[PDB]
Amino acid sequence: MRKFIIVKNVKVDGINAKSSDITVGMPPATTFCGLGETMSIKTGIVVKAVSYGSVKFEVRGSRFNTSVTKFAWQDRGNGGKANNNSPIQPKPLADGVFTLCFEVEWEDCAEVLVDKVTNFINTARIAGGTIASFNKPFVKVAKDAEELASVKNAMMPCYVVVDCGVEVNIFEDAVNRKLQPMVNGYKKLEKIVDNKHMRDKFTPAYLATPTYTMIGYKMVSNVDNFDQALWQYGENTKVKTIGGIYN
Amino acid sequence: TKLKAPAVLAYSRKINPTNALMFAVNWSDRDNTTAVMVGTKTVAGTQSVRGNPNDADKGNIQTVNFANLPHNKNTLLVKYNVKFVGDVFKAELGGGEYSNTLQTALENTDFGTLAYRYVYNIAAGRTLWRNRVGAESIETVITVNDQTFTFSDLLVNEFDEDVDVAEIADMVAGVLSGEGFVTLKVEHYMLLGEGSEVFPSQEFVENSKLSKQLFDLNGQAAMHDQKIGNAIRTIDTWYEDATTPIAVEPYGSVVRNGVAYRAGNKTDLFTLMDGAVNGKSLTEEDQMFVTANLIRGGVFGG
């Protein structure tokens, strides 16, 4: 027995489009799983999965180059060079209207759940982008599978993410089978021995290289199983769909 | 030391006619100006294509735009406004120095009989292309700055001497020799006959069900301004072995006859322009042809 809260038409601008070194565009499912665990921390409603779809999404720039951001002189000790233009590190920006659907388990009324999600989203930040606007979130429940599809079709219109898996690698199949690659998680390289320059000193830290899976965009109504669009934190330091690989 | 023509050298049209609207009047009450509508008819016949003696009898249905005089009016009226513009050697896209040396190579061109041939082509009714074939008389009325001129019988092939064409051509050549402009409001009255068929200009349409599609201004039969202007500039009797006046072209070229009368005999416009800018003294007819091209207009470069 499943419960969901849907925030439709989440207009967000200033999204850090740099998903990884080789992916620029839509934020991956690690971003929205991070947003889900962020509310698990601030609001206390513990979130299993998030199904996110893109209503609108434009990467700022041309069709072959992204619009770089005019950097500001914010480091310490480079005064004197501040009159000249700051050097640009690559961070593409994008705008996106999203539709989010969080699997939550809740025991109180739907009004306080909607208010808690609204108070989170008013202080949230989708992929480094300020949430410009969002409709009032609404609670829908998936008692059975037809009710699961009711929740699924309540995200209309949006293009959700379905996992199609890795055959050999990322570049090969992106040309061959023409699917989109995105960060489904990370791979740990080395333990980090210096916790002085970090957010926490006690949380263990690892250098990571983003693993990618290959995904497709399908409209939420054309997705047969809603579990193939709900991304959640898998126990391989990755994220994964509940329904597995989309067929 | 040859003065090469710039690639960007272009002259504008300095004889600008309007679209010649075609009305129907009687020969008596020419103020009863009723407009000739283009109708559309579909006509059955046979296909008689040169290389098809098999489709010969099968049949041929064609949708053609037609325009006719109404059966209560025997006179076609053609109304348009020629606009002779001066400043004829300032190329609006050309270089300064090449157009200046072409201007000071062509200051002594006889503009008088150039203007006479233009106004004669207006007055004899060459702007009526097929609308003159079959006509008891052709009356051309030209209003030139509050001065009405009347023209009854002028053979179009040769430029006969008369005082009214010369009178209009006086200020037309005064415009073409210097600054300013002159407007010629032309009204043609062809006594075609009761219910006679008139000939407007035809448009080119590529993927259309109409076999022939005439030019229509809000449904009214009309001639294209380029056809009227071609009939203005049909003054060239100065090419090699000239028998009839042809349109002034940079190559002396006509499309229907499939021959260029000035290509391959070093009498084309570009060779005489390079001669004018390099000290070759031009003849009077040769200067007049080059200046007629300069007021026809065109880009001459490369």
């Binding site: 893109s54 990322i170 090969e172 690659p181 | -």
Partner: protein, 59 residues
Amino acid sequence: GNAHNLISGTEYLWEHKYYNTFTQKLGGSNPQNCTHACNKMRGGFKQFNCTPPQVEDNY
């Protein structure tokens, strides 16, 4: 970021004519202070254009 992904992806997606991509010069004006691959491949690295399909508003 994986360096093999950047270099081999740029070489392969230029080789296999995959033009659903962005191109970014990493080091800036003079990328030799960044990285030897940024120093030599001055034309920019190929990354995937990860834009999703849009929803047409008029429907």
